[PDB]
């Protein structure tokens, strides 16, 4: 139909995050059979192949930002590919990798629909700046490049010349924040970004939280929704095989729930599954739980609802 | 600011509880870096050192109550030190240890603010009497010394001469009770204490529970709040390295949530982290999960909120 029409983009890129090993992100999610587990319900699945990530050998660092140009080239390439698959009328399933790719994943999505919304389900806001981080790791600076209210204040870090900030600060909702460095929360409070952290998640209940999140984004006007989803935003009892595990995340139930509310609007238009890392599970059973979690999250995004999915013929026959 | 201004009081005392080993309570919480993990956000941290616990050699037992005078001397000493750090205008971070210390921890807090409230987050009520317990262990009788409605009925057990009951039965809320011996629940029902056990926690949802808890304590009038927090009140999947583990506790998410609601009133005025015991984890990984849990609980008390914490300067610079 309109929804569950999928363009898969595997993006094995790592150089935004330091723990090398997330480049077996799309490989493990595909060998866990995400394609065929879509194909039971009416999923128009078209794999577009993995993106080539060239290696700039002299990707010389910035002041704090390190590996900048590889990240910027990867996200520009992904912005072109996301714009391609959104001109294909599909829902962009862009899975990596790391949050560095979400720059172009939101950018190329805005190249077709400039008035979308971003549900950034993550343990962290990932809105550090190149100037006021202390890491310089670009797996936590995608959102700072994308907000128009931050323009004139973001440095011209190389690789990011193509970057146009494309989303508004009032057009993004964080859900499941649980570890924020101080620069990101000043940005969070000064821009007036609406957010439901694990405080507000527990306060309203996850259902009233998704109710008010859809009342904030879609309560004004129907518009495309871009669920960009980290897998450390869930609790590390379910996904310990991630890059930055922080205890106290969402239960696996509620992660599936957030995806199902985004489905039952019928307005899912872009999906990111980042920070999957099979190299950091202490046992392969940890990796198995993590990858089965992220697969079933992606299933419940496109309408593998826990209520049921059907084909409209009589089955008493 | 007003909140996140911390006076740390380590209190390595054990003789209220039988399982010796909780006297490495403040040692492990400090070597897990609770001080420095406060110091990112605006935490005025002033360590006041550990309290000396002298050993009464002939601490002769009562009828059922055993090691009474060491508990009473420790809690009187702690009542003086809590009154000292509350005259310092800070929020009393008193971490042990065991719930025997919470006598003086609520008493010295009432010596400055006589009309406070107690959020006793614990698996147990810990309101046995010296007469109608069957243990006689003073890690479960602090609340019976402190309620004015129980006066004329508490024995003059030695060491407890200084004890003035200081809080009202309508001024205390239990959250997360899950194993109560019969004497404590008769006290609980006859005094008309408001409480939200894991029944009522699941009934309202943890957010509506904290909503009605703040509506019960602060809905009448703004007043100081004394979160006295056990670490067995959470589920032993997260803290198995405690003294009395009972299955069915709060999720680690919801424990962090209860602390964050107490923060976002801006009225946190006293904090207890008791029953941490590194000696009872079957693996050191169990101890590691338990201590990281209790540390991040203490962080989310003083406003390491999961939404974010900031310093008010522009970070796009």
């Amino acid at each position, epitope marked *: 139909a309109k929804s569950r029409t999928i363009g898969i983009i595997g993006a094995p890129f790592s150089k935004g995050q*330091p723990r090398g*090993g997330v480049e077996e992100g799309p490989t493990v999610l595909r060998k866990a059979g995400l394609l065929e587990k879509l194909k039971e319900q009416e999923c128009d699945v078209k794999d577009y192949g993995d993106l080539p990530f060239a290696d700039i050998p002299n990707d010389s*660092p910035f002041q704090i930002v390190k*590996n900048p140009r590889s990240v910027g080239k990867a996200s520009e390439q992904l912005a072109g590919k996301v714009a391609e698959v959104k001109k294909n009328g599909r829902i962009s399933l862009v899975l990596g990798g790391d949050h560095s790719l979400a720059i172009g994943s939101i950018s190329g999505h805005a190249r077709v629909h400039p008035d979308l919304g971003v549900i950034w389900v993550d343990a962290h806001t990932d809105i550090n700046t190149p100037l006021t981080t*202390t890491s310089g790791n670009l797996h936590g600076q995608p959102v700072s490049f994308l907000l128009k209210e931050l323009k004139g204040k973001i440095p011209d870090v190389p690789g990011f010349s193509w970057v146009t900030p494309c989303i508004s600060a009032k057009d993004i909702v964080y859900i499941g924040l649980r570890d924020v460095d101080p620069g990101e929360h000043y940005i969070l409070k000064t821009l007036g970004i609406k957010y439901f952290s694990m405080t507000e998640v527990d306060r309203l209940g996850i259902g009233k939280v998704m109710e008010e999140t859809l009342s904030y984004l879609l309560g004004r006007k129907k518009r495309p929704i871009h669920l960009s989803f980290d897998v450390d935003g869930l609790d590390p009892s379910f996904t310990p095989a991630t890059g930055t595990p922080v205890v106290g995340g969402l239960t696996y139930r509620e992660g599936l729930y957030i995806t199902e509310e985004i489905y039952k609007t019928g307005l899912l238009s872009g999906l990111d599954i980042m920070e999957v890392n099979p*190299s950091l599970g202490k046992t392969p059973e940890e990796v198995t739980r993590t990858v089965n979690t992220a697969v079933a999250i992606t299933l419940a995004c496109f309408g593998l609802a826990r209520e049921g999915n059907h084909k409209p013929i009589d089955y008493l026959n | 600011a007003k909140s996140r201004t911390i006076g740390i009081i380590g209190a390595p005392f054990s003789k209220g509880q039988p399982r010796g080993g909780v006297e490495e309570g403040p040692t492990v919480l400090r*070597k897990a870096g609770l001080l420095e*993990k406060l110091k990112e956000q605006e935490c005025d941290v002033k360590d006041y050192g550990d309290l000396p616990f002298a050993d009464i050699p002939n601490d002769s037992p009562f009828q059922i109550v055993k090691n009474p005078r060491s508990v009473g001397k420790a809690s009187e000493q702690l009542a003086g030190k809590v009154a000292e750090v509350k005259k310092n205008g800070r929020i009393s971070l008193v971490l042990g240890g065991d719930h025997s210390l919470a006598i003086g921890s609520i008493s010295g807090h009432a010596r400055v603010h006589p009309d406070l409230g107690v959020i006793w987050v614990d698996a147990h009520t810990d309101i046995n009497t010296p007469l109608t317990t069957t243990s006689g262990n003073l890690h479960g009788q602090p609340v019976s010394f402190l309620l004015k409605e129980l006066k004329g009925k508490i024995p003059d057990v030695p060491g407890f001469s200084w004890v003035t009951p200081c809080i009202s039965a309508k001024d205390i809320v239990y959250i997360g009770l899950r194993d109560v011996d019969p004497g404590e629940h008769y006290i609980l029902k006859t005094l008309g204490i408001k409480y939200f056990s894991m029944t009522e926690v699941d009934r309202l949802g943890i957010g509506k529970v904290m909503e009605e808890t703040l509506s019960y304590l602060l809905g009448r009038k703004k007043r100081p709040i004394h979160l006295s927090f056990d670490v067995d009140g959470l589920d032993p999947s997260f803290t198995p390295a405690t003294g009395t583990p009972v299955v069915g506790g709060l999720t680690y998410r919801e424990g962090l949530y209860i602390t964050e609601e107490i923060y976002k009133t801006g009225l946190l005025s006293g904090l207890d982290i008791m029953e941490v015991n590194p000696s009872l984890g079957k693996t050191p*990984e169990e101890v590691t999960r338990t201590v990281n849990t209790a540390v991040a609980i203490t962080l989310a008390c003083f406003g390491l909120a999961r939404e974010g914490n900031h310093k008010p300067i522009d970070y796009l610079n």
Partner: antibody
Amino acid sequence: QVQLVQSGAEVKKPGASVKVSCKASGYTFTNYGISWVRQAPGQGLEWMGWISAYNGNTNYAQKLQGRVTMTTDTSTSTAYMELRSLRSDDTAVYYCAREGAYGYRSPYHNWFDPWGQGTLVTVSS
Amino acid sequence: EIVMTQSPATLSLSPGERATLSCRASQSVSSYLAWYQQKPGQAPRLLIYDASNRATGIPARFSGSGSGTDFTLTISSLEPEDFAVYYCQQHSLLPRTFGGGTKVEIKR
């Protein structure tokens, strides 16, 4: 400058372990992360565990899970490594070095730049 | 357990010219490894931090390259204080293996 003063050369039978003191200085601590590596003499080297000093992330290695324990002491910038069920294969020089914390506020680091001086441990009874 | 293989096992070069060394990976470590200076009975100090770029107290002559399977350690201005067992060490895969040994002797 950026160093690691270790302590200290010690032999244990197969029994209790050697909590190796790995004292840091120079660089700001909990902005980075300290790991551990064994080296038997006349052999190669095996990394054996890395903690982030940022927040207690244990992250041990294969064949000792289990056997290793690693904590922080971040009052003083030291970090520690014990062992469990010691064995005469662990007649190794134990080095600690700084992999950088792989958290979120911690700078890009892949490369072990303090190196400590070593710790002569031979597990013989 | 990616095995890191150092192609010069031993080395004996005079005080003088380049002493380019080789370290190979069994996978793509991809510019994520380092170089060390283990003097006998000493601290195996860092030479080269992330396949390049010469960390923080390095003298003048310790360039190197890689990205991403078979890497180089160039000692261009040999400087006979540098006679030590050298180690490459991969990093960004667990568990974090090492090279074999690159005993830089004296050529005489």
